[PDB]
């Protein structure tokens, strides 16, 4: 048991599913507490990367809140050039380690920085958004409000992302207000949504914007 894992009872279910999180976990994958709670399970990340490499111009993608690299790794495996951004230097170190384990570190440029302040000066074909939702407690809300229950504010993250591109992918809680999420598209805006499942269990949603 890793120190983070042994330290807390609530991390036991993430450890149990370590291979659903990273298939190559035993090849030296590392995460911290928040990393465990937040990492996109591999099958879901692979699915999202597949859809992106299908329906969008897909050369350069910004992973704006890259965490431990769950999504970043999957984008890189499809051959997209990724700009991976996280405000936490520890996450960047973890993500860099995990990308190497998967043999695609060279496909990625890592930035420790605040996406909110970088966005206006970034250029890319696709922006992928997997922000903090407020830890595991996010689920205790009957309906997740992306404006009031998310920091940074979900509409603000989207507005800044729009400076970069119209092709935006938003990774969001399974109890997210779907009316709210859809409204991000604005007037006449295009949006398609999917529920992401792991073993027939509802996990999260992903919204695909632009065309």
Ligand X SMILES: Nc1ncnc2c1ncn2[C@@H]1O[C@H](CSCC[C@H](N)C(=O)O)[C@@H](O)[C@H]1O
Ligand Y SMILES: C[n+]1cn([C@@H]2O[C@H](COP(=O)(O)OP(=O)(O)OP(=O)(O)O)[C@@H](O)[C@H]2O)c2nc(N)[nH]c(=O)c21
Q: Which residues are annotated as a binding site for N(7)-methylguanosine?
A: 133
Any idea what DSSP says for residue 135? S
Site map 151..190 versus ligand X, x via CB under 6 A: -x--------------------------------------
Which does residue 58 bind out of ligand Y, ligand X, none, counting CB within 5 to 8 angstroms by kind? none
Cα(7)–Cα(9) distance, integer angstroms? 7
Cα(80)–Cα(127) distance, integer angstroms? 12
Instruction: Work out whether 204 is an interface residue with ligand Y (CB under 6 A).
Output: yes
Instruction: Using the rule CB under 6 A, give the single segment among 36-44, 47-55, 106-114, 116-124 that binds ligand Y.
Output: 36-44
Kindly state the greatest CA–CA separation across the chain.
51
Q: Which of 20, 30, 93, 116 binds ligand X (CB under 6 A)?
A: 116
Pairing, β 60-63 against β 126-129? parallel
Instruction: Work out whether 16 is an interface residue with ligand Y (CB under 6 A).
Output: no
Residue with tokens 């230097």: 89
Cα(56)–Cα(136) distance, integer angstroms? 31
Which does residue 186 bind out of ligand Y, ligand X, none, counting CB within 5 to 8 angstroms by kind? none
Segment holding 74, helix H or strand E:
helix 70-77
Instruction: Using the rule CB under 6 A, give the single segment among 91-99, 100-108, 120-128, 136-144 that binds ligand Y.
Output: 136-144
């Amino acid at each position: 048991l890793p120190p983070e894992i042994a330290a807390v009872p609530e991390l036991a279910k993430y450890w149990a599913q370590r291979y659903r999180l990273f298939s190559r976990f035993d090849d030296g994958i590392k995460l911290d507490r928040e990393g465990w709670f937040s990492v996109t399970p591999e099958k879901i990340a692979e699915h999202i990367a597949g859809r992106v490499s299908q329906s969008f111009k897909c050369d350069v993608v910004v992973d704006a809140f890259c965490g431990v690299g769950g999504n970043t790794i999957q984008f890189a495996l499809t051959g997209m050039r990724v700009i991976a951004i996280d405000i936490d230097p520890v996450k960047i170190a973890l993500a860099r380690n995990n990308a190497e384990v998967y043999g695609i570190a060279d496909k990625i440029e890592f930035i420790c920085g605040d996406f909110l302040l970088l966005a206006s000066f970034l250029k890319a074909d696709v922006v992928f958004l997997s922000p903090p939702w407020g830890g595991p407690d996010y689920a205790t809300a009957e309906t997740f409000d992306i404006r009031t229950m998310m920091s940074p504010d979900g509409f603000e993250i989207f507005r800044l992302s729009k400076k970069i591109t119209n092709n935006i992918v938003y990774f969001l809680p399974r109890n997210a207000d779907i009316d709210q999420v859809a409204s991000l598209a604005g007037p006449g805006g295009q949006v398609e949504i999917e529920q992401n499942f792991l073993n027939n269990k509802l996990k999260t949603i992903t919204a695909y914007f632009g065309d």
